[PDB]
Amino acid sequence: ASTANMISQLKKLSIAEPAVAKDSHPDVNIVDLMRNYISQELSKISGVDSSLIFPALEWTNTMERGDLLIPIPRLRIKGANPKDLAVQWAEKFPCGDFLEKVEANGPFIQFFFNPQFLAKLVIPDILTRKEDYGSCKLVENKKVIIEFSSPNIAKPFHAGHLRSTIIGGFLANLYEKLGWEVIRMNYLGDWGKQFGLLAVGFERYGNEEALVKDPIHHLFDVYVRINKDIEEEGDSIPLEQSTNGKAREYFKRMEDGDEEALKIWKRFREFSIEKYIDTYARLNIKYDVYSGESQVSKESMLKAIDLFKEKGLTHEDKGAVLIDLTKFNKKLGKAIVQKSDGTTLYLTRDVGAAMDRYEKYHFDKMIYVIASQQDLHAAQFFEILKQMGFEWAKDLQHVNFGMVQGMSTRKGTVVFLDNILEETKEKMHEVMKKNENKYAQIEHPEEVADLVGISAVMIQDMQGKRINNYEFKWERMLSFEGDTGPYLQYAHSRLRSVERNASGITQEKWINADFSLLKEPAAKLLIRLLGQYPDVLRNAIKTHEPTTVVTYLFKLTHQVSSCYDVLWVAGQTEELATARLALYGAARQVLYNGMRLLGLTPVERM
RNA sequence: UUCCUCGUGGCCCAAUGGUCACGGCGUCUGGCUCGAACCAGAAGAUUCCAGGUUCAAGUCCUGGCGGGGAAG
């Protein structure tokens, strides 16, 4: 046997334990292949079980320290001296065609993959599976429900709601790529005093004809004014006669039955959902079901109430049903689940909704993409499902995120998301016209500008970890130089130009290129880069951070761009021209994959 | 007042507990006779403070300070 054989032995090798081996996928992750190899070999040298070595292998910070490394201390070898072991094991390590070099360094052992070896396997793999390159089957017939955005249709959809939307869109695409069935659910906040306020407000300032001219502009004007009332008349006018109370009243009429209200409501409900469907689509998102606070009946809600008692979780307080979660967690406190008047509160509705979902979908996992401002709530909610004894309770997860600051209707700082997009599109359109020759070759400058701007908007948000807050600033959405959406778009766009620029050669020929011709440092760094996308995605699903992907995407595009200035595809020998076309080709495919994963839309020209 | 969360270069920000902290912006020097929305090079750090756990801390623990959030 030999090299093509070692690969087989390594692909059908579960050196990892029943737990971690479910992570080893030598077949679709070059780094895993190496993890296997390195483990098998280092075991033969060290005497240490390979299952102990595998998880001790770490991907490096920068590509200067190798492709993987292992901290000897981690192996916990009694009385040993890591620095010596490193040296010993390192100088004796079999490189073969896999590794380029193994070098001891302090208590660590670094492993430098052989770029040639990588090239021959990764590019073809990438060029062949294309949109499925990063893919990996991490789950066996599992269904997940991801509830995201879930806005209150009675309030302006501003820049702040961009977050729960794109994050949820991301997790959805990510989960699918790793083998999950995904239900994209928008849990619309469409049943309460808030809508009441909007309805009342429409009587006060609404104008049926202006509504038709531009529903949204008018409705916003309505929202604005009616809200000035609640503010201006603070604690004066007695409830029944005040605006606020008048709003609560309108909701009563609905929750009561008033066929008159349930009509103006349903009218709004249908319309809003239509307006939303376009917006989400403009962000490459298509919900499977548009649920909502309304969709959870008093049946499901009360059935839950009984369960709280049935399990001895509630206590009576002057007619109100409460739940003191202290027993379970001091920080959780007490929660009102139903008030004296009988009205079940939102904490109870959420539990209803939950149970309803488990019944209808029998999901293996449900992800709640809410904002950090609902941390306590989310926690209580989860705790309750636990103590209710639901098996699935343990399959619920809350993915939070920081807030976009600088959005206030009463401060006039408010700016709708549809407009943020639009305004950015126009700006991107102008920079696009700065280059006549090129601009001329674009068929739909408008469509493309909007794609470019959206990438700008999305990336600037996904660059840092969800948890981080950030100040709304137009310059954040309008920048195109440096690490910005436009940067990725331009890289993708120029890699395509290079392709078109050499139609003379086609993909089929790329896969069988003489990869040995990709020996330059720049090409090596880029090759190594290419084989990490698979690890990136799997790590992405652990951190649930768009930034996990975006960070990679820039290292990739950065390296690509470096290469772009030294490795020409044009004016070369057909042999070298095909070699680099396969390199840039794969690079483009990976960038394509990642961008889509994040929810952006690659552009061919800009 | 109680709880949570963030604090990394002048500004934004990354990091599996694993070595001498990744990028962008600003700024300095260069490069337009397959896309310069770019590239090459330079300078800028003790990762908020006092400690602690650990072979190893930006990362974990306690407390302080500051911003944000939540509860009362």
Side-chain angles (χ1 to χ4, degrees):
Chain A
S2 191
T3 298
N5 300 170
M6 294 206 69
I7 297 182
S8 304
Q9 154 55 54
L10 256 28
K11 281 178 185 173
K12 195 165 189 175
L13 184 60
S14 186
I15 57 182
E17 69 171 65
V20 61
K22 177 51 190 177
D23 279 302
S24 189
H25 295 278
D27 37 67
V28 302
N29 182 323
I30 190 69
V31 189
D32 271 352
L33 184 84
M34 297 296 206
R35 284 186 185 88
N36 280 22
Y37 180 78
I38 296 181
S39 290
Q40 161 182 291
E41 290 315 311
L42 180 57
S43 177
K44 299 180 193 181
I45 294 179
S46 66
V48 183
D49 168 35
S50 49
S51 288
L52 260 31
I53 297 176
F54 193 77
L57 294 178
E58 303 189 322
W59 55 54
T60 51
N61 299 160
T62 49
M63 279 174 64
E64 313 194 305
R65 290 176 178 176
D67 291 285
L68 287 173
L69 56 56
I70 173 160
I72 303 299
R74 207 163 171 178
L75 293 182
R76 301 176 188 173
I77 296 169
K78 294 173 186 175
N81 183 299
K83 292 168 189 168
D84 301 322
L85 287 195
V87 184
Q88 304 177 189
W89 301 354
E91 310 190 315
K92 180 171 186 177
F93 205 101
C95 289
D97 279 315
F98 296 71
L99 278 27
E100 178 186 284
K101 62 164 171 174
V102 174
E103 309 193 316
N105 184 313
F108 303 82
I109 287 188
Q110 319 189 311
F111 298 97
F112 293 79
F113 301 166
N114 177 318
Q116 270 298 301
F117 175 71
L118 297 171
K120 307 187 176 185
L121 302 182
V122 190
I123 299 184
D125 181 39
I126 294 175
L127 254 34
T128 291
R129 287 156 63 198
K130 300 188 174 180
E131 60 288 309
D132 278 310
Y133 176 50
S135 170
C136 162
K137 60 302 177 188
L138 292 171
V139 291
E140 52 184 311
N141 312 296
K142 305 298 177 183
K143 195 191 296 180
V144 63
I145 284 170
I146 298 174
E147 179 205 295
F148 54 110
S149 191
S150 311
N152 187 315
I153 59 175
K155 316 179 63 189
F157 198 63
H158 56 74
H161 301 86
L162 178 279
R163 307 224 75 192
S164 179
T165 303
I166 64 174
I167 294 186
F170 167 63
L171 300 188
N173 296 332
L174 178 64
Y175 270 78
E176 303 196 316
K177 281 298 173 194
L178 297 181
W180 288 82
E181 192 196 317
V182 190
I183 311 298
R184 293 178 179 60
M185 178 185 296
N186 198 327
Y187 183 63
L188 302 176
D190 62 7
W191 193 266
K193 309 171 189 176
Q194 200 71 66
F195 169 69
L197 177 65
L198 187 67
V200 176
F202 188 66
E203 311 182 310
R204 193 106 86 201
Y205 313 86
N207 166 45
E208 183 63 44
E209 65 168 50
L211 176 77
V212 174
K213 276 297 181 183
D214 180 38
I216 308 181
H217 189 77
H218 182 57
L219 288 173
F220 180 53
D221 179 44
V222 173
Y223 179 78
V224 178
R225 290 176 175 287
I226 197 58
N227 263 299
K228 288 192 180 184
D229 298 324
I230 65 174
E231 171 174 46
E232 177 181 58
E233 59 185 57
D235 303 64
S236 300
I237 305 70
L239 220 54
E240 183 187 304
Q241 189 65 184
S242 76
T243 308
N244 178 294
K246 201 144 294 299
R248 289 167 158 287
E249 285 175 49
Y250 201 116
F251 181 47
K252 169 181 179 174
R253 291 174 54 190
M254 300 188 276
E255 184 173 293
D256 209 65
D258 190 307
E259 297 68 55
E260 217 289 297
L262 282 300
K263 249 305 174 184
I264 218 172
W265 174 76
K266 175 178 287 65
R267 182 194 178 194
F268 185 74
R269 181 74 161 44
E270 288 170 49
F271 165 70
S272 68
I273 291 194
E274 284 176 287
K275 287 264 71 61
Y276 275 113
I277 291 208
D278 297 321
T279 303
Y280 292 123
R282 198 181 171 184
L283 303 179
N284 284 306
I285 298 176
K286 176 181 184 184
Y287 289 105
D288 293 315
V289 50
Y290 280 81
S291 187
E293 308 177 305
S294 73
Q295 302 302 288
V296 29
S297 61
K298 65 166 186 180
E299 296 79 298
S300 305
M301 292 184 79
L302 276 58
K303 173 191 170 192
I305 291 291
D306 295 314
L307 265 292
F308 306 148
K309 305 162 188 170
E310 184 176 303
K311 293 285 184 177
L313 301 173
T314 58
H315 73 213
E316 302 297 320
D317 178 46
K318 295 185 181 177
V321 195
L322 288 60
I323 298 186
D324 170 288
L325 299 163
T326 291
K327 283 188 169 181
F328 321 103
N329 194 317
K330 304 172 181 174
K331 305 169 187 166
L332 300 184
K334 292 181 171 58
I336 321 300
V337 296
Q338 179 167 49
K339 46 191 302 175
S340 299
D341 46 61
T343 291
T344 45
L345 296 184
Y346 293 103
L347 193 52
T348 283
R349 185 181 293 279
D350 291 351
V351 184
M355 299 174 73
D356 289 317
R357 290 171 187 170
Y358 179 65
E359 205 48 44
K360 171 156 191 168
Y361 302 101
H362 296 286
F363 57 71
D364 293 287
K365 181 173 188 182
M366 179 147 75
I367 299 182
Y368 284 102
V369 183
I370 317 169
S372 77
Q373 312 186 187
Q374 303 298 163
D375 288 336
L376 178 54
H377 163 52
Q380 306 178 311
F381 168 52
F382 282 11
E383 191 55 58
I384 296 177
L385 280 313
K386 188 180 191 176
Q387 305 308 300
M388 284 170 82
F390 296 111
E391 325 83 64
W392 41 268
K394 71 165 174 294
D395 294 295
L396 277 47
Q397 180 169 43
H398 168 46
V399 179
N400 76 326
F401 58 83
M403 76 182 289
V404 173
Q405 293 161 179
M407 292 284 108
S408 176
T409 307
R410 41 179 285 279
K411 287 185 181 177
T413 57
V414 56
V415 185
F416 288 76
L417 181 60
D418 286 323
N419 296 317
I420 294 293
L421 264 38
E422 198 59 42
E423 226 290 71
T424 300
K425 157 187 184 168
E426 310 195 318
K427 295 298 188 175
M428 290 303 138
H429 193 179
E430 290 312 295
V431 35
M432 197 177 298
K433 299 180 182 183
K434 249 72 176 190
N435 193 319
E436 286 186 53
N437 184 288
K438 289 295 175 183
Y439 186 84
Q441 308 168 55
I442 299 176
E443 272 306 300
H444 296 297
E446 282 284 290
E447 287 171 52
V448 173
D450 188 46
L451 290 178
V452 176
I454 289 171
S455 77
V457 173
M458 298 180 83
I459 294 298
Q460 67 75 48
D461 175 283
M462 308 176 133
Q463 307 208 63
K465 293 197 287 302
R466 310 194 299 297
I467 200 45
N468 300 315
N469 288 305
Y470 70 81
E471 198 77 52
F472 175 71
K473 280 187 176 180
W474 281 106
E475 59 186 302
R476 280 181 67 117
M477 318 296 207
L478 305 174
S479 302
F480 50 99
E481 307 192 299
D483 290 1
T484 69
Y487 183 82
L488 298 180
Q489 286 280 29
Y490 186 73
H492 182 287
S493 180
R494 72 161 147 193
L495 278 177
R496 265 282 173 167
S497 183
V498 174
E499 280 180 35
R500 287 189 268 83
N501 163 60
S503 309
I505 307 178
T506 28
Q507 289 188 51
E508 27 290 287
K509 291 67 183 179
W510 301 356
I511 299 192
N512 297 287
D514 177 6
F515 297 108
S516 56
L517 277 39
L518 301 179
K519 64 300 169 185
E520 303 87 338
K524 294 195 184 175
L525 280 304
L526 179 50
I527 288 176
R528 292 166 62 191
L529 235 38
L530 296 168
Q532 297 169 29
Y533 187 55
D535 270 335
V536 164
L537 291 190
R538 200 204 306 167
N539 188 46
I541 201 158
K542 188 182 81 175
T543 79
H544 287 171
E545 295 276 17
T547 194
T548 293
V549 175
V550 186
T551 293
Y552 169 70
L553 243 32
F554 277 103
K555 294 187 181 184
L556 176 65
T557 49
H558 284 326
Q559 193 46 46
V560 160
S561 301
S562 283
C563 291
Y564 193 88
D565 259 71
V566 299
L567 311 189
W568 284 78
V569 165
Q572 313 294 317
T573 64
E574 191 183 77
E575 297 91 319
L576 183 61
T578 298
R580 322 230 248 205
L581 260 170
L583 176 53
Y584 285 114
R588 191 201 77 66
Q589 184 62 56
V590 174
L591 168 62
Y592 177 80
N593 294 1
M595 286 175 75
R596 290 253 286 175
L597 194 87
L598 294 176
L600 311 184
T601 302
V603 302
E604 314 275 304
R605 291 198 178 73
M606 73 182 75

